[PDB]
Specification:
With 238 residues, the chain is of the alpha+beta class. Helix content is 32%, strand content 24%. The longest helix is centred in the middle third of the chain and has 18 residues. Monomer. Interacts with PABPC1; the interaction is RNA-dependent and stimulates ENDOV activity.
Length: 238
């Protein structure tokens, strides 16, 4: 069973704030936003992997902080509980930065994965967000099939309606609640991004921010985190 994980997960889920809490979020151009973070864990198997934390200036989107660590994810792989394998390394990644170079601390994290759009309403973005007490956004490349959501023909039809970079349609679960937003992040891309609330940010602002960070199809902090992880996995493979 997973009674401990389920309990910890519900306990933390109750902490989730799905509204804007920071002044810069309430500004139409994110005035007062200076640092956006990006995190990524990428696999070699499902055990040895790389965890990367990146911090970018905003709105310039230049790398001002970068850190990658090879790690062993030996915790059980159970669907709906993946955060429990990855978050302690990401958290440790958010804790050294705060203790060592807190001036480079990101005001928000962009996470490759999901937020409330999740099997148990508490993806890695929520987990990390709550555990760090940082505003946090889930930016997934695939649609997680929860609450009746699925990438069928209808969904793709909705994707076709997305015309411009910044166009979006709501991901409406069967429970009547909006779980996230499909976002067209570039004029020339085809597949949308899937945005959901992690912590301390409204869905609307999460989408707008993700778009603001998209120099290319993938939001720059997430992209750079992936680049770092990739480089370290290649370097390790040597």
């Amino acid at each position: 069973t997973l009674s401990l994980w389920k309990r910890e997960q519900a306990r933390l889920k109750a902490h989730v704030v799905d509204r804007d809490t920071e002044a810069w979020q309430r500004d139409p151009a994110f005035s007062g936003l200076q640092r956006v973070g990006g995190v990524d864990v990428s696999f070699v198997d499902s055990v040895r992997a790389c965890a990367s934390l990146v911090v970018l200036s905003f709105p310039e989107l230049e790398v001002v902080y970068e850190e990658s660590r090879m790690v062993s994810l030996t915790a059980p792989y159970v669907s709906g509980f993946l955060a429990f394998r990855e978050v302690p390394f990401l958290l440790e990644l958010v804790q050294q930065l705060r203790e060592k170079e807190p001036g480079l601390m990101p005001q928000v994290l962009l996470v490759d994965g999901n937020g409330v759009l999740h099997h148990r309403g508490f993806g890695v973005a929520c987990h990390l967000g709550v555990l760090t007490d940082l505003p946090c956004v889930g930016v997934a490349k695939k649609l997680l099939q929860v609450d009746g959501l699925e990438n069928n023909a209808l969904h793709k039809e909705k994707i076709r309606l997305l015309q411009t970079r910044g166009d979006s349609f709501p991901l409406l679960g069967d429970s009547g609640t909006v779980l996230g937003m499909a976002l067209r992040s570039h004029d020339r891309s085809t597949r949308p991004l899937y945005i959901s609330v992690g912590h301390r940010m409204s869905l609307e602002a999460a989408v707008r921010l993700t778009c603001c960070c998209c120099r290319f199809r993938i939001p720059e902090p997430v992209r750079q985190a992936d680049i770092c992880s990739r480089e370290h996995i290649r370097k390790s493979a040597a």
